[PDB]
A paper describes a structure:
The novel SRC inhibitor eCF506 displays subnanomolar activity against SRC, a potency that is on par with the current best-in-class SRC/ABL inhibitor dasatinib. The majority of SRC kinase inhibitors bind to the catalytic domain of SRC in its active conformation. To characterize the binding mode of eCF506, we co-crystalized human SRC (kinase domain) bound to eCF506 and determined the structure to 1.5 Å (for crystallographic and refinement statistics see Supplementary Table S1). Remarkably, the structure revealed that, contrary to our previous prediction, eCF506 binds to the native inactive conformation of the SRC kinase. In this conformation, the C-helix is moved out and the K298-E313 salt bridge (a hallmark of active kinases) is not formed, thereby switching kinase activity off. Remarkably, co-crystal structure analysis reveals that eCF506 induces and stabilizes the native inactive conformation of the SRC kinase domain, where the C-helix is displaced away from the active site and breaks the salt bridge between E313 in the C-helix and the catalytic K298 (39, 52). Hence the mode of binding of eCF506 is optimal for inhibiting SRC but not ABL, providing a sound explanation for this unique selectivity feature. Structurally speaking, the mode of binding of eCF506 to SRC (DFG-in, C-helix-out) is analogous to that of the dual HER2/EGFR inhibitor lapatinib on its targets. Biophysical characterization of the hydrodynamic radius of full length SRC (human SRC 84–536) in the absence (Apo) and presence of dasatinib or eCF506 show that, whereas dasatinib induces opening of the SRC structure, eCF506 maintains SRC in a more compact conformation, similar to the Apo form. We show that the inactive conformation of the SRC kinase domain induced by eCF506 is relayed to the full-length protein, keeping the protein in a compact conformation, likely as seen in the autoinhibited SRC structure. When SRC is forced into a closed conformation by eCF506, its SH2 domain is not available to bind to the FAK-pY397 docking site and form the active complex with FAK.
The SRC kinase, product of the first cellular proto-oncogene identified (1–6), emerged as a potential therapeutic target in the early 1980s. Although decades of research have assisted in elucidating the central role of this nonreceptor tyrosine kinase in the transduction of multiple oncogenic signals, either via receptor tyrosine kinases, cell-to-cell or extracellular matrix-to-cell communications, accumulating evidence of additional roles for SRC in cancer keeps it in the spotlight. Predominantly inactive in noncancerous cells, SRC is aberrantly activated in many cancer types, including breast, colon, prostate, pancreatic, and ovarian cancers. In the native autoinhibited conformation of SRC, the SH2 and SH3 domains interact with the kinase domain and form a compact structure that blocks macromolecular assemblies with other proteins.
Author numbering: 260 to 423, 427 to 536
Write the structure that this text describes.
Amino acid sequence: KDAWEIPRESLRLEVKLGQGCFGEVWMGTWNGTTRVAIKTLKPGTMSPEAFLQEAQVMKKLRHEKLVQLYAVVSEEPIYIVTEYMSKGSLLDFLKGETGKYLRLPQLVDMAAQIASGMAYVERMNYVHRDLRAANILVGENLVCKVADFGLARLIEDNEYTARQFPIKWTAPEAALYGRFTIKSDVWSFGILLTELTTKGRVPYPGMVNREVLDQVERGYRMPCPPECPESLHDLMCQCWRKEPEERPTFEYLQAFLEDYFTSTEPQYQPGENL
Ligand SMILES: COc1cc(-c2nn(CCN3CCC(N(C)C)CC3)c3ncnc(N)c23)ccc1NC(=O)OC(C)(C)C
């Protein structure tokens, strides 16, 4: 069951979906039979051994709301092979043609699905380290899956990529002191909730990374997004407690969001955008 390293010749890279900071994502075909996504890593951006050791852990994480790792090509340039998610990143989906039609019920259901995957990560005593809408994938029927879990711990710049960090999504104890835990992921999830309720806008509008760190450190928190109910902003603010142990669990977040329109905001009615 550990024989998941594959020869590069077993993959056809057929359609380039986009370019990231560290490589490319392709739609392709594996073993002549299977539709896959292929994520490529420029040489020198990740230690092959360290990747394989982490991949052994990641291959064990199996949940309907986590993207499934199928295979790796372990020679530089490293290729990661996963299931194909037909609507791409949640961030692109929110910002695309469909995004303008999403209302609060769809966005809260998407949040509940992300919370369910993260509750699994929580049960497995694992840590994502880079939770944000860019690292959620969307399929048919608004299925959302958590992607890119664990990788941030291993990613480095090469000479090229160095000429180009998600501070705005990162809990202060993680950004400042390297204290990455499930509770720093909960902070990230709170920021992700702002991405959902603004249909993809960058957090802390008008602020650069240094201003965000300065302001958050002195107690600043984002205010309630336009048309967002106060009750959902209150949940965001629980995720952004200074004391990490006082932030909610993903188990709690999942339950709150699943039950939201019955228990919390039954008075919901559609407005201009939500
Ligand atoms: C094949 O490996 C992955 C693929 C994807 C993925 N990313 N994307 C979106 C590509 N998108 C990035 C945004 C860009 N815009 C900014 C212009 C346009 C292109 C996918 N789309 C459909 N299926 C996928 N599977 C992926 C996301 C993550 C991974 N890898 C991964 O999660 O690795 C582990 C499972 C090991 C954590």
